[PDB]
Design a protein around this ligand. Structure first.
Ligand SMILES: Nc1ncnc2c1ncn2[C@@H]1O[C@H](COP(=O)(O)OP(=O)(O)OP(=O)(O)O)[C@@H](O)[C@H]1O
Ligand SMILES: Nc1ncnc2c1ncn2[C@@H]1O[C@H](COP(=O)(O)OP(=O)(O)OP(=O)(O)O)[C@@H](O)[C@H]1O
Ligand SMILES: [Mg+2]
Ligand SMILES: [Mg+2]
Ligand SMILES: [Mg+2]
Ligand SMILES: [Mg+2]
Lengths: 380, 382
């Protein structure tokens, strides 16, 4: 069962956690990324392919040596993937990844399936006049969005008023964009879905908190949220994921609106930051679940249940190249703190350097244990 | 710079591997001393590892020259090279400790003065039936004939039902230093994992262990059906045993619970032990996380070794077939809340510890129910 070889496009922390799981199962993983990547570092064998998963020919080498190829990002060359689909299984599917990696197309496909979402207008002209018109239809503020290559919200620009139109466009020059109606959410939610060969399952709904457009915190499960909203959100995520072909873990972002209704923010065709808490909080982490789904191995549902309330805090670079080691050093003394350093090295501000996951029998207790670290992070 | 230190591990097996697993999470470098491609090395792709044996003087010397601290994943190492190197590298736990622990007759003779309860025993100065018998005549039958040295998985012990048994005994444990212990009729076996640090002595809760063909099979944590009085008594015994040795690190203590509720020591392991594998999922800080911090003087918050939910651990022991462990692993895939750990040792040999499965649940009763089918399976295959 475990003699197959899994190829992973990307060798960052996501790829790494993934390799932690395969290692557990003695399943070989061949990472395609820079030599030395966080993920090649815990997997000492010769099967790895050095290069970019944006580069056609490497992806080609990866493929020809693997039984299944998967990705640890949604910005991979799905055309290069399309080429080898003859040679190797690809999961999830490259069409699904293709639709998904372009934020506008993902939304329009989803619309066919009736998924609650924020209204938007594709921007064909990229002229301040075109945008003014949208503004009139959608109102301010508006969230100007890049369709592709999007992450950490570096390709998004909040347009508060007709007057920011120029800064917005200068900000997001040379890209296809769409403008989306503003989501007045009271909380951001996320659900990790496991799409298998036969079913679509999900972990419980959690609460995500981004600072500076970057994920800073996750509370699992979501604080002050009725089991119903929880289910609803889950139920929604599963349905949105089902509109895709292929297997594996999908990260689903959502918005909790003031009336407690739910809208989809965006889907990620791969294991995702919101789910790192499953390492310590559930029987099978999303990494475990991903491997299993793409190789058709059983996935008991109770294994995706949350064992104890957990709170995950990302370690993000600050200006000083050690800060991440500062957060971690502090972490060493937080009770019930589980520390994950990414072995990326020296920090660049805003880079994801590691994460700390804290558990306790109750959320309150967990919040109490981690505050001091949260504090340290804020201050420094 | 706390995690910039380098850790040398004498031994690259499953235990060292799990140690590496912890070091990896803290991004701490570990230089493994063992054969190329050993389990621990496989998840550690750097060029610092040492190729050779933990029983080998110079290899041990070489490794030492390469790190800040040397620790071990096994008891059977050259404590004479470590003594040679003590002025060059910190070694934790102490080489003297491992030196004493590695010889079981010496370990127990050391503990006798610290007043630890244990079985009566007699060293065998000659491995002559003539000798074994007079011994037979001193502690009665049946008795456990045991090699003081290179012991594991009972691969060095023989139960001696009686005199007719003798010759077999000697032949099985031929050309080894031996000792003989009076039989211990326990009503159950228990173990406590202890951690010695620069300023404290911590411990995990007591668990119930179950051996089969003298190899550890399962672990129930905490121990089922043991009064509160018993766990304390157990915790104390263990901690008392540990205290008789110097060094920082994790130690495992195996005890016997007798019919009358008294506990006697079975053996103490100078390092991470099978009894604690459940800590990976049962606690915030695993025994492996604990060991690394202890030896590096890093904080170990106490609440981090408290158990989160009941758990049961089961070892995947090889059988006649060298792929059966995959069969157990494979059945595990379907057990609810079962976390599979496979060691990457290759084809199985009989009795080899191939990997382990850990199942947790809000209650032991539920953990047991989940696990049963897996047990049923492993047993079929025995
Ligand atoms: N219409 C909107 N209204 C309000 N807030 C929005 C809107 N779109 C985005 N946001 C805020 O922007 C954040 C980042 O948006 P998004 O997830 O769409 O960007 P990204 O670059 O895709 O991020 P990621 O790092 O997750 O790939 C959201 O998590 C939410 O906080
Ligand atoms: N006197 C004794 N009476 C009865 N059983 C005994 C006795 N000594 C050992 N055993 C049985 O043998 C089991 C394994 O023996 P022991 O730990 O001494 O050997 P070992 O080779 O050191 O094994 P390991 O290091 O793998 O634990 C004990 O757990 C116990 O159940
Ligand atoms: Mg995104
Ligand atoms: Mg997002
Ligand atoms: Mg032993
Ligand atoms: Mg033992």
């Amino acid at each position: 069962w475990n003699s197959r070889k899994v190829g992973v496009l990307g060798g960052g922390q996501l790829g790494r956690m993934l390799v932690e799981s395969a290692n557990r199962l003695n399943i070989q993983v061949n990472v395609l990324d820079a030599d030395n990547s966080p993920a090649k570092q815990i997997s000492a064998h010769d099967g790895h392919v050095t290069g970019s998963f944006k580069e056609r020919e490497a992806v080609r080498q990866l493929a020809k040596t693997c039984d299944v190829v998967t990705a640890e990002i949604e910005h991979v060359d799905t055309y290069a993937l399309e080429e080898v689909a003859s040679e190797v299984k690809i999961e999830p599917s490259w069409q699904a990844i293709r639709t998904i990696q372009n934020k506008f197309n993902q939304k329009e496909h989803l619309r066919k399936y009736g998924i609650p979402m924020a209204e938007h207008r594709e921007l064909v002209e990229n002229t301040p006049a075109e945008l003014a018109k949208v503004g009139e239809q959608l109102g301010y503020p508006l969230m100007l969005k890049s369709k592709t290559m999007a992450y950490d919200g570096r390709g998004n620009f909040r347009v508060n008023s007709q007057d920011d139109i120029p800064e917005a466009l200068e900000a997001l020059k040379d890209r296809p964009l769409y403008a989306e109606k503003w989501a007045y959410f009271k909380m951001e939610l996320a659900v990790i879905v496991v799409k298998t060969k036969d079913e679509v399952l999900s972990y419980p709904t959690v609460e995500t908190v981004q600072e500076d457009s970057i994920c800073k915190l996750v509370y699992a499960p979501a604080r002050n949220v009725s089991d119903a909203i929880n289910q609803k959100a889950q139920e929604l995520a599963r349905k949105a994921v089902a509109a895709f072909d292929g297997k594996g873990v999908f990260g689903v972002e959502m918005f909790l609106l003031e009336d407690d209704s739910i809208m989809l923010c965006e889907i990620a065709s791969r294991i995702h930051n919101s789910g790192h808490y499953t390492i310590e909080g559930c029987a099978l982490s999303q990494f475990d679940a991903h491997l299993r789904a793409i190789l058709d191995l059983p996935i008991p549902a109770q294994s995706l249940e949350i064992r104890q309330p957990s709170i995950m805090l990302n370690i993000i670079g600050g200006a000083a190249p050690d800060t991440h080691l500062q957060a971690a050093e502090c972490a060493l003394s937080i009770p019930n703190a589980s520390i994950h350093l990414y072995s990326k090295g020296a920090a660049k501000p805003g880079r994801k350097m590691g994460h700390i996951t804290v558990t306790a029998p109750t959320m309150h207790e967990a919040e109490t244990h981690i505050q001091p670290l949260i504090d340290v992070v804020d201050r420094i």
